[PDB]
Amino acid sequence: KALRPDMGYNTLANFRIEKKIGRGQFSEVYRAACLLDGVPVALKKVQIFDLMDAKARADCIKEIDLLKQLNHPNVIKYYASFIEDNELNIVLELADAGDLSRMIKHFKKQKRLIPERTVWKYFVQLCSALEHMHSRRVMHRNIKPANVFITATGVVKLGDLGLGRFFSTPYYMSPERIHENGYNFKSDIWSLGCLLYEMAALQSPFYGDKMNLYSLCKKIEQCDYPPLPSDHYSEELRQLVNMCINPDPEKRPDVTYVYDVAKRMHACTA
Amino acid sequence: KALRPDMGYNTLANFRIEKKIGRGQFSEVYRAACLLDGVPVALKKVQIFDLMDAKARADCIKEIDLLKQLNHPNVIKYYASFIEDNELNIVLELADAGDLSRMIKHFKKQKRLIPERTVWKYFVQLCSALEHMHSRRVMHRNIKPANVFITATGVVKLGDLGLGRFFPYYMSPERIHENGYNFKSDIWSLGCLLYEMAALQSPFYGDKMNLYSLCKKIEQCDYPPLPSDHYSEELRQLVNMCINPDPEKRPDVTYVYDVAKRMHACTA
């Protein structure tokens, strides 16, 4: 099909698909380049007709409409969404950045810890991102190290694809997932708490080895995680983690509060 | 006009107009509130059926469709555009805090120069915004301190109050020759704005300023040189190449962004 510059990012003719890089319940994801400007992008084809009922389709369209309105230094961009060839086509940023997963297993090999000062540098940006998202009534739904990208310069980008430009049972299970299959805005806070623990501890709070799913549910119920070392990490980091990893969603702080703490701690640690 | 959550940001019903904040040749801008999320927005109403012929209507629609694709932290986001009550309605990111115009005046009244460190801190963000617009083949057409918003956190938001892009603050040579507006016309504006950040006045400003003297000063690019004691050769040379009568010899925004990024990294 022939180029149509008037359409910009809103037609498949302006993209060359490279390879499939992902399959989901409802979607396939590709690496593509825009033909107008040569920018590498992720192209998510969602079967809103062939794989969803009417309720799923409408809710998914509403959600993508909100996501492509976000405009924040620390969020992976949704560049476009349009219907063509009977699918919802979503064009997303692939960032020139490593995922926090990679950085974590790096420090692990080198038997070193991320100093509290760097942790706050990264965590304040994630919190800035999530505050932006919750202010437009958008839940993230999969906060994990694989979805957090860090640039050359140390700017954080939160995505939901787990795919950078160059390198690539949900990861942190909440009590409300275990018990009621529920996910709300406070479920993002739970995950954010677990990610702050993982940056300091270099492993998930509910990690273990053998690990029955049943043992993993028992530990989550009791919030039974190894305490962080009080010699390496302030009481205010360890407390923020404890407030976030709370079995009751209602008792977890809102992201405004977590962002405010991250901002005070960035300020007094830099 | 009563609520409809299903219709989203795409009908006037889900918005309360709170006051006018802008007026252009073909448009009014309002501060408004989304009743679905309590988020405050700007609402531009464009008179595509009363002040416009078919050509201008079709051009203005094509442009709005390209503008709503822009997505950059330093560019005012366009959330939605729809036709309702016989206008083209646009729902935009509101930047209701300050702007470069208010900052420049603040420094002017305090009889203080803006430190070069601070100039690059704001200027690299404006360059970032414009590199994004140009990469998508979108001209700004109305670059001036008042259209450069600044959030509480000090994030630059490049906007356009009253779509002055369809119609200046910075008389360019390609206005004096009537010649019309292109990508390198944005670069002229950009160089004048950098100058004004360092001098606290437009490069062609005068007390008893009048069209004759202005046309002469643009013809010769006659602006008071910046104090070499306060502002680097790099900053002065970057102003110098942008303020050039020939659009084809002005640098492209990628080059200006690259210098700004490198000058920012150095002075911090």
Side-chain angles (χ1 to χ4, degrees), chain A residues 2-168 170-270, chain B residues 2-166 168-207 209-268:
Chain A
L3 263 58
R4 294 210 257 144
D6 43 310
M7 293 301 316
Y9 276 45
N10 271 253
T11 206
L12 291 175
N14 289 339
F15 299 92
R16 184 179 64 254
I17 288 128
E18 299 176 22
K19 45 178 157 310
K20 206 162 295 229
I21 58 182
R23 195 198 206 77
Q25 210 149 68
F26 301 126
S27 63
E28 320 257 349
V29 196
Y30 305 80
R31 165 141 197 166
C34 186
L35 295 173
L36 300 200
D37 63 11
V39 173
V41 301
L43 170 47
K44 190 167 197 224
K45 302 184 182 271
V46 182
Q47 259 93 273
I48 54 170
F49 303 122
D50 305 342
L51 289 178
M52 297 185 168
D53 75 299
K55 182 61 166 63
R57 162 200 312 134
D59 289 4
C60 166
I61 285 170
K62 300 328 162 44
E63 185 97 346
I64 301 322
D65 281 348
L66 291 184
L67 282 168
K68 83 171 191 297
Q69 286 173 15
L70 302 185
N71 194 30
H72 196 279
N74 307 112
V75 180
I76 296 295
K77 306 307 186 155
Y78 283 69
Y79 285 135
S81 71
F82 57 96
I83 297 166
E84 176 171 342
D85 305 339
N86 225 55
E87 296 160 326
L88 183 62
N89 299 274
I90 311 175
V91 186
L92 301 96
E93 165 171 30
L94 297 167
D96 177 20
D99 48 296
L100 176 61
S101 185
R102 252 167 202 76
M103 185 200 263
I104 273 160
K105 68 178 174 182
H106 180 79
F107 270 84
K108 204 184 176 72
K109 295 292 184 297
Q110 296 171 307
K111 294 177 179 180
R112 215 198 308 283
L113 293 166
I114 309 168
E116 173 150 353
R117 183 174 63 84
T118 302
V119 164
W120 290 123
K121 194 165 94 82
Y122 297 156
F123 189 80
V124 67
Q125 292 181 82
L126 267 161
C127 298
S128 198
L130 202 62
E131 191 282 326
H132 183 59
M133 290 183 65
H134 289 185
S135 86
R136 309 317 184 80
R137 305 207 162 278
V138 187
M139 303 176 215
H140 191 281
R141 289 191 215 262
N142 202 21
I143 295 169
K144 59 180 197 201
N147 274 324
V148 176
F149 305 98
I150 312 173
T151 57
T153 53
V155 320
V156 175
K157 306 292 258 284
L158 173 64
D160 47 13
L161 244 56
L163 305 171
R165 190 165 296 185
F166 299 120
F167 320 98
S168 89
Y171 190 87
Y172 302 131
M173 207 119 63
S174 62
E176 63 261 38
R177 180 97 60 196
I178 280 173
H179 280 118
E180 292 127 39
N181 326 284
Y183 203 96
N184 62 30
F185 295 96
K186 297 288 194 67
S187 314
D188 283 339
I189 304 299
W190 172 275
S191 285
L192 194 68
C194 296
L195 186 134
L196 178 60
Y197 180 94
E198 190 146 355
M199 280 185 296
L202 302 188
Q203 63 198 66
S204 298
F206 306 110
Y207 176 59
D209 263 30
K210 166 201 62 84
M211 226 41 158
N212 255 42
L213 264 67
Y214 189 40
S215 172
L216 177 69
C217 295
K218 285 174 190 180
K219 283 158 117 197
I220 288 171
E221 211 198 79
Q222 284 189 10
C223 294
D224 175 14
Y225 58 90
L228 290 169
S230 54
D231 47 312
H232 290 264
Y233 299 108
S234 74
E235 197 175 331
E236 24 275 298
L237 188 155
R238 284 186 280 105
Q239 251 280 277
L240 184 62
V241 171
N242 191 55
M243 277 172 269
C244 289
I245 301 181
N246 190 292
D248 189 0
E250 306 282 13
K251 295 282 161 48
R252 293 182 208 141
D254 64 24
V255 64
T256 298
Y257 178 92
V258 181
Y259 187 33
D260 196 75
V261 169
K263 274 184 305 179
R264 287 160 177 276
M265 294 303 295
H266 185 48
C268 76
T269 48
Chain B
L3 193 69
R4 278 178 283 169
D6 50 309
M7 205 77 105
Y9 272 49
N10 291 289
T11 172
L12 292 175
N14 305 344
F15 294 104
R16 248 175 221 142
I17 302 151
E18 278 162 18
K19 58 158 179 170
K20 175 172 309 198
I21 61 177
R23 187 189 151 76
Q25 213 155 342
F26 303 98
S27 54
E28 325 249 40
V29 200
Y30 302 91
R31 186 201 177 129
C34 194
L35 299 173
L36 306 204
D37 49 21
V39 174
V41 294
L43 181 60
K44 286 176 182 166
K45 296 188 151 159
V46 190
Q47 282 95 60
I48 58 153
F49 300 121
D50 299 352
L51 300 164
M52 268 174 182
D53 47 284
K55 179 58 162 57
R57 174 194 315 125
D59 289 348
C60 169
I61 285 180
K62 286 184 252 271
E63 290 206 358
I64 297 298
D65 283 340
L66 291 187
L67 282 170
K68 69 202 301 200
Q69 299 188 12
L70 296 178
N71 197 334
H72 192 278
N74 298 128
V75 172
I76 280 302
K77 190 84 178 75
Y78 283 48
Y79 300 141
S81 87
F82 50 94
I83 287 153
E84 181 180 338
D85 304 351
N86 262 70
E87 306 177 301
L88 184 60
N89 303 278
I90 305 161
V91 190
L92 304 92
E93 188 187 358
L94 189 70
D96 218 13
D99 67 48
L100 189 52
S101 188
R102 290 164 96 186
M103 173 184 272
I104 282 167
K105 261 132 190 181
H106 163 105
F107 275 92
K108 211 182 162 42
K109 293 152 184 288
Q110 277 190 316
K111 295 283 165 66
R112 278 201 304 120
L113 290 188
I114 300 181
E116 177 161 341
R117 149 184 78 265
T118 312
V119 171
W120 291 119
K121 190 220 285 159
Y122 293 116
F123 189 69
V124 68
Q125 289 178 71
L126 180 56
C127 288
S128 200
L130 195 71
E131 196 277 332
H132 178 68
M133 291 183 76
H134 284 195
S135 72
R136 298 304 185 84
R137 311 289 317 264
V138 177
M139 294 176 206
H140 190 278
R141 290 211 237 245
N142 199 17
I143 297 176
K144 62 196 199 189
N147 270 336
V148 181
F149 309 117
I150 303 179
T151 71
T153 56
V155 179
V156 170
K157 297 278 172 174
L158 179 62
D160 182 18
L161 278 183
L163 298 169
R165 67 170 302 103
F166 306 115
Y169 193 87
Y170 300 125
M171 199 75 83
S172 63
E174 46 264 58
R175 194 76 197 90
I176 280 169
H177 298 73
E178 260 157 49
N179 261 354
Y181 201 98
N182 65 32
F183 289 100
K184 295 287 180 90
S185 310
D186 284 342
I187 300 298
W188 168 273
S189 284
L190 196 61
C192 291
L193 184 146
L194 176 58
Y195 178 85
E196 189 170 339
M197 276 177 87
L200 299 173
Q201 59 188 55
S202 318
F204 304 112
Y205 159 95
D207 301 4
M209 187 53 39
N210 59 95
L211 184 63
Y212 190 92
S213 184
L214 172 60
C215 284
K216 194 212 213 89
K217 276 158 74 200
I218 290 159
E219 189 182 71
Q220 315 178 321
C221 287
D222 185 19
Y223 61 81
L226 290 170
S228 73
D229 287 349
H230 295 280
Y231 298 107
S232 70
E233 184 195 2
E234 289 79 352
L235 191 155
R236 296 192 282 101
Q237 185 43 31
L238 184 56
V239 169
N240 184 40
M241 58 191 77
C242 292
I243 303 179
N244 179 301
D246 187 2
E248 286 184 354
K249 314 232 197 90
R250 292 176 211 146
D252 70 26
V253 70
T254 299
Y255 173 92
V256 180
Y257 182 33
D258 278 337
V259 173
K261 254 153 44 174
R262 286 158 192 71
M263 278 313 284
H264 182 45
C266 166
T267 56

